[PDB]
Amino acid sequence: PKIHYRKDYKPSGFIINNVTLNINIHDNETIVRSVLDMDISKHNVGEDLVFDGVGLKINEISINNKKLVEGEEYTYDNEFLTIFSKFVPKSKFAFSSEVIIHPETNYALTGLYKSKNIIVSQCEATGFRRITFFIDRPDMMAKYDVTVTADKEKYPVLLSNGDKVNEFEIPGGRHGARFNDPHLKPCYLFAVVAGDLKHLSATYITKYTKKKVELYVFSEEKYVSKLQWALECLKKSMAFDEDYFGLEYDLSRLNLVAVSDFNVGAMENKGLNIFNANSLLASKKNSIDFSYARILTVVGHEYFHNYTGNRVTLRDWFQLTLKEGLTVHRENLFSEEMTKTVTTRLSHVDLLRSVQFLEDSSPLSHPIRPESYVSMENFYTTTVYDKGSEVMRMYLTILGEEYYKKGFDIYIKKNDGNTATCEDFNYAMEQAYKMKKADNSANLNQYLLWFSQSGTPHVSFKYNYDAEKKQYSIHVNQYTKPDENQKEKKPLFIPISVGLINPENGKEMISQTTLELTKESDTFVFNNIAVKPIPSLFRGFSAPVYIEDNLTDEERILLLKYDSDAFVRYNSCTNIYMKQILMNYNEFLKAKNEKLESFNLTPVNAQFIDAIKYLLEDPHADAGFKSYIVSLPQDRYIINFVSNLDTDVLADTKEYIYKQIGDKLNDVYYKMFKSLEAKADDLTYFNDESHVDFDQMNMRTLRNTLLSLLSKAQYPNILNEIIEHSKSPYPSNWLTSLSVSAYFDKYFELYDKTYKLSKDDELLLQEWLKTVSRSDRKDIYEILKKLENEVLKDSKNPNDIRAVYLPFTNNLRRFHDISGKGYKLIAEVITKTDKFNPMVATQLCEPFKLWNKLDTKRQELMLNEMNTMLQEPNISNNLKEYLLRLTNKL
Ligand SMILES: Cc1ccccc1NC(=O)N[C@H](CC(C)C)C(=O)NO
Ligand SMILES: [Mg+2]
Ligand SMILES: [Mg+2]
Ligand SMILES: [Mg+2]
Ligand SMILES: [Zn+2]
């Protein structure tokens, strides 16, 4: 396979200054005429001029109006257009091509494609080359003049990046519109849309310069009623970037557009952000609660890219984390501000420590700045995004807000209108660090190891208290396991936010402080510590690491009850659960492997259970927080701690723990489920798509979590509650009713009731699919076949395929059926999907990432299906690279 290496970056021998496009859409073809105003750079050595261009049908090629001919002046192999150097001019020249493409048959959803009745593009990362010829790499920055033409009745709204400078009629019922985007950009930010779209709009006035900006949000007509919250979220995002970062929008208009068929969440094309409809559209009668947070985060994310990605872009794709890590960090700061709920930060931590930690202990492990790739599209990973965001957040922790803002402004201004690298960011942050330390010899050179070193550090602690001296020490060690990327791992710069809690009264003993660990080990000593404390470590999850607190369960309970920091309280609970899970898992495993007739199980700590009850009964404690403490850690977190994991033993472990706790708490759970109803399900704001009460949402989450627990338990007469819950106006509630009814004979009645409620809204039907797929049913395989035959059928919509299959792959007992039948079903889907959408097929591989963590029979089953997939003729490069890497062949 063809391998790109970070070290081999070199600037191009060519420059593309202007791009003038005419995109003429017809029913059975799209013609793209393109003039590139080009020149030779200072790096040119008289090389052949080689353009990327994939799957293009050439009508004509010329340079300075001289037609070039195949075999004589150029070659084209359906991937690269090579213009022989004799025919490449030595100063400014005009390159002209006209090609034919077919959006109507583009089911890969990259390049120019049709999504229902909308024509849309997706160019990041390598899609622009499927539209026209280009030197398709992000350092080739140019200005764009785009004309779109189409049939007027079918495609009345025509959009491209930037200012609409003309609109015109064309004979034969056609029309055109011309766009000028004044801002230099890489081709990955080009976009066009053509459709019968409806809109909402508003005018936004910028905070500092008072620029009037016209904000438009677009969808198909059926769903125009679902646009308002996105528009509100865009206004919020703009105000946030003004308020925190001092950054104003830079065009007279910003359009956001929803499309039904989209490979991921959304895309930041300049002035023309394009979204999966599931990440832009909601209404309170037709969407679950989680849609609202999802739209907030995705609108925010694309908006924040306007500076971190667009106004400052990437030198090369190895720098991906510089825009994605940084933008996710911005998106998270925004989300935390807008929701004002502690569960927001906790959700980010949960995502990292489950999926990203698994990735980082897998054969796919990479640093946030990879050293090589075959398909760049396989490095849009939770590592690059979520670990990257934690790396970007650690700068804020280290510097504090004021000096963080100073550093960020150095970066964004210095590199405006240009490309940048991860080093440029580190350099800006290092200038701020020098200022903060008031020491021009302070440096962040060690910090760069967070970009280059793969794997998750493990940080462990030992404590000592000297009562006579009132002096406390925290001894800290860090270790990162060697891997395929580095045989020797170096210590990182790890910021450890800490507090100290007095166990006798629950109060804070020090001003919070941030320990700067830079060696493999260090001892931090505190004076004037009046009694032996319990330490509150890694507050806010201050570095992306495995934490070994070396606390007793009694100490963890005291932090859970009394500490101030939500992450520490949550992590203390997580740790109590993990100790229990690992102990019961080992008990069950030994019993199974030794074929014992009788054995013991370690009970769940009774004082921990008492602590859960105390928290749940505190009417002044946070409902979202409560929902985190009654839930065991996710399976993808637990697996990071077990080698040769037997999934059936784990399922039995989790069931035992849950049942131990419910046997004590179910009456508490029931009382709370009823008491919370009035506030949870109050209809304030039910008609207001500009305002969400995230606290009330967390109350519904808690009710729905409790209802699940009580349903699994078969708590007496709970079916009555489930049936009432199905009548609630909130989709979060009535879909919960279907999930929790899995444990009762009423499940198929609720399956039909909820289907009827869901079937007339595309996105609600997809949420219904997910609810069915995740249902804890012994007959889940027969239900999946029913979904395939009755609902999914031949759909090529990635949201339908993902909705049917992904939730089911998280069913620990059933997906990992020891027959292998789960692995086989998903591998058949992956292979089917790969023949038309390789990016989605690779997404569907997710469950296999943990293969080498399983017991050896399951490892063998998964490996056999991965190798079967690899044998498939015409396997995509995306899938083949992914699977070769995952199975330790690449
Ligand atoms: C792909 C992915 C990987 C990891 C985490 C989140 C995403 N989702 C996107 O929507 N990503 C888009 C990618 C774009 C190339 C379509 C993104 O970052 N939008 O700004
Ligand atoms: Mg083609
Ligand atoms: Mg996000
Ligand atoms: Mg559809
Ligand atoms: Zn992004």
UniProtKB/Swiss-Prot annotation:
Binding-site list for a peptide: 124, 265-266, 268
Location(s), subcellular: Cytoplasm
Other facts: May have an additional translation initiation. Translation initiation at the first Met codon would generate a form that contains the signal peptide, enters the endomembrane system, and ultimately reaches the food vacuole. Initiation of translation at an internal Met codon would result in a form that lacks the signal peptide, thereby re-directing the protein to the cytosol. A nuclear localization signal would then lead to nuclear import.
Function: Displays aminopeptidase activity with a broad substrate specificity. Preferentially, cleaves after Leu and Met, but also cleaves after Ala and Arg. Low activity towards Lys, Phe, Tyr, Trp, Gln, Ser and Gly and negligible activity towards Glu, Asp, Pro, Ile, Thr, Val, His and Asn. Has dipeptidase activity. Plays a role in the terminal stages of host hemoglobin digestion by cleaving the N-terminal residue of small hemoglobin-derived oligopeptides.
Full-protein residues shown: 196 to 1085 of 1085
Record PTM: The full length protein appears to be cleaved into a 120 kDa precursor. This precursor is then proteolytically cleaved at the N-terminus generating a 96 kDa form which is further processed at the C-terminus into 68 kDa and 35 kDa forms that remain associated.
Activity profile over pH: Optimum pH is 7-7.5. Active from pH 5 to 9. Has less than 20% of normal activity at pH 6.0.
Spans through the membrane: none
Binding residues for Zn(2+): 301, 305, 324
GO molecular function: aminopeptidase activity; dipeptidase activity; metalloaminopeptidase activity; zinc ion binding
Keywords, ordered alphabetically: Aminopeptidase, Cytoplasm, Dipeptidase, Hydrolase, Membrane, Metal-binding, Metalloprotease, Nucleus, Protease, Signal, Vacuole, Zinc
Effect of residue 264 to P: Severely affects substrate specificity. No effect on Zn(2+) binding
Listed name of the protein: Aminopeptidase N
Annotated site (Important for substrate specificity): 264
Family statement: Belongs to the peptidase M1 family.
Any Gene Ontology CC annotation: membrane
Biological source species: Plasmodium falciparum (isolate 3D7)
GO biological process, any: proteolysis
Activity modulation: Inhibited by 1,10-phenanthroline, EDTA and bestatin. Inhibited by (Benzyl)Tyr-Ala (BTA). Activity is not affected by phosphoramidin, PMSF, leupeptin, iodoacetamide or pepstatin.
